[PDB]
Amino acid sequence: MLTNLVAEPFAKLEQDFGGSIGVYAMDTGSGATVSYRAEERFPLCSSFKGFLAAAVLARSQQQAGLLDTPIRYGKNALVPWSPISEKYLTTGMTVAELSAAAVQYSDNAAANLLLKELGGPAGLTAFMRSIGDTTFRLDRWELELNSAIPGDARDTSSPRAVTESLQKLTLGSALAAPQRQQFVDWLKGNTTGNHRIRAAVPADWAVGDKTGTCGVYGTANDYAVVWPTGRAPIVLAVYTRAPNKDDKHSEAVIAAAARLALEGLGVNGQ
Ligand SMILES: O=C(O)c1c(F)ccc2c1O[B-](O)(O)[C@@H]1C[C@H]21
Numbered sequence: 001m002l003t004n005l006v007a008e009p010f011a012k013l014e015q016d017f018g019g020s021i022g023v024y025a026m027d028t029g030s031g032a033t034v035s036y037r038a039e040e041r042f043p044l045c046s047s048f049k050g051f052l053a054a055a056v057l058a059r060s061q062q063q064a065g066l067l068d069t070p071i072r073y074g075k076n077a078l079v080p081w082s083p084i085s086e087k088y089l090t091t092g093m094t095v096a097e098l099s100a101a102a103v104q105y106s107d108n109a110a111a112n113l114l115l116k117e118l119g120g121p122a123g124l125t126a127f128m129r130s131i132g133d134t135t136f137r138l139d140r141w142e143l144e145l146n147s148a149i150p151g152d153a154r155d156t157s158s159p160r161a162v163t164e165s166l167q168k169l170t171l172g173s174a175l176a177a178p179q180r181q182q183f184v185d186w187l188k189g190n191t192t193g194n195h196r197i198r199a200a201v202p203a204d205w206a207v208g209d210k211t212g213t214c215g216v217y218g219t220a221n222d223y224a225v226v227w228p229t230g231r232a233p234i235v236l237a238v239y240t241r242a243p244n245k246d247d248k249h250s251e252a253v254i255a256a257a258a259r260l261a262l263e264g265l266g267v268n269g270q
């Protein structure tokens, strides 16, 4: 009833990109939605790291002092793309610092260390099940989870399930109020998303996001909570893939899809 009240040229955009774009956007005030390939599976890539940090925060509600726990790690933990954890190899970092690094710099070593804390990919999957997400699945660790093989459901979710879970965690009751705001604050401080959803969001609106980039099969993504001034927040997810292993991803296509989603919701932007 409230889905796709205004059609947008997502098909033309994905054809120009040479792949598939999946979009789900939710106006949390009216419940209106924009939906395009929203129930197809796309590889999570690093976008799982936001939900990873939420799962850690959930655990911290029952474990006072979890976030402050210092974690030492060896050089064998430092897999490629670990920009924060490599600078603290000789000192260690706290669980909260590892969570912030995973969210804000997509730190791979931090993500693997936190996955171990939660009981591995099945433990993160169990957390997502506990909030009502039956679509999300994490199956592997960094870096193997980025393979993005066409048709492979491992390490995927759907744009719709990503948006629904993000809403529950950032705006709903899935986390206690202090942990909810900490999750929002980590997302707001993300440094890797300036050319994706944020490029579609006016500078005077608050926004938090988590990006993902698999490095193959034109596969990259971003999800965000957006607070336009004077109205209810918007939650949205934009995922891409492409048929060939050497197909490149496009940040511009993600930003353009985000623009179309906001336009489809009637949210006046840039
Ligand atoms: O490795 C990084 O990407 C990185 C980081 F994650 C946090 C801070 C810095 C980094 O590198 B740089 O831009 O050369 C600079 C000292 C600053």
Ligand SMILES: *[B@@]1([O])OC2=C([C]=[C]C(F)=C2C([O])=O)[C]2[C][C]21
Pocket: 045, 046, 047, 081, 105, 106, 107, 108, 192, 211, 212, 213, 214
């Ligand atoms: B992950 O998918 O996140 C990521 C990587 C490399 C470059 C990026 F821009 C991103 C991202 O989008 O956050 C590697 C670590 C993984």
